[PDB]
Design a protein around this ligand. Structure first.
Ligand SMILES: [Zn+2]
Ligand SMILES: [Zn+2]
Lengths: 148, 75, 51
């Protein structure tokens, strides 16, 4: 399995050089299902929050993107209440040269810099675009409530 | 002349305008206030979409009228 | 004569395997990028359409 070779390689690279901002690995015996955390970025309203993600590598990874979803509730225009993430590299802009590490980095950038013009959750996108402070407040409150 | 622009999110913006201000101008004020490009703004008054080249007065928008802003978002 | 990785499988590019160079000049293992290009026209690295 290319997927498994690659998932293992990525895992080994993570163990060799762990990131600061994230952690990830397989759930028990399941190499295709990972849990991950990402830190709410500093200077975002998610700061201080630890956000848990569930990652499912498809069996034709890396030719198809990993499914990545938040399990921690988060208030964000590109992440809905099921934790689906609307992030181009997880859908149409996937490349097999991307790695879970890069995905987590893009997710972290997505937290820092939402894409409210391509939202998953229009209500939040709208608030983000017209009342950033409210968005910041709510996202902070949700961070405090769910991710801390 | 004060007019209000109520966003879909319920936030109301007070704009200082003149009856001769174009919808384009109002959009520019919203851009100025909110950072929202005019091309993302749909402005509606009293069930009518406001067209860029028309003026506030062409729509009988008077002081204390509330226009509605709806942003154009992709999905 | 490099330890450069095939960005798809993350193994050495210069292992036994056939490599394929795309028109953007990015190189991958043939097997690796073939499987990608069967479903995408885009170089995995630079996203330039190969066609
Ligand atoms: Zn390869
Ligand atoms: Zn290329």
């Amino acid at each position: 399995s290319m997927a498994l070779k690659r998932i293992h390689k990525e895992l080994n690279d993570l163990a060799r050089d762990p990131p600061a901002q994230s952690s990830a690995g397989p759930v028990g015996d399941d190499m295709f299902h990972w849990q991950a955390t990402i830190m709410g970025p500093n200077d975002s309203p998610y700061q201080g929050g630890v956000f848990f993600l569930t990652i499912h590598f498809p069996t034709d990874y890396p030719f198809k993107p990993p499914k990545v979803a938040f399990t921690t509730r988060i208030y964000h225009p590109n992440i809905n209440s099921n934790g689906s993430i609307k992030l181009d590299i997880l859908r149409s802009q996937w490349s097999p040269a991307l790695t879970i590490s890069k995905v987590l980095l893009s997710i972290s950038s997505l937290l820092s810099d939402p894409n409210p013009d391509d939202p998953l959750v229009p209500e939040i996108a709208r608030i983000y675009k017209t009342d950033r402070e409210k968005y910041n407040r709510i996202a902070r409150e949700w961070t405090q409530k769910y991710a801390m | 002349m004060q007019i209000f622009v109520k966003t879909l999110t319920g936030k109301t913006i007070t704009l200082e305008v003149e009856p001769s201000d174009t919808i384009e101008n109002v959009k520019a004020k919203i851009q100025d206030k909110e950072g929202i490009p005019p091309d993302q703004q749909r402005l509606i008054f009293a069930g009518k979409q406001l067209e860029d080249g028309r003026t506030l007065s062409d729509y009988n928008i008077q002081k204390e009228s509330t226009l509605h802003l709806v942003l154009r978002l992709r999905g | 004569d490099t330890d450069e990785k095939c960005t798809i499988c993350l193994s050495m590019l210069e292992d036994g395997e056939d490599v394929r160079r795309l028109p953007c000049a990015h190189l991958f293992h043939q097997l690796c990028v073939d499987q990608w290009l069967a479903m995408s026209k885009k170089c995995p690295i630079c996203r330039v359409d190969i066609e």
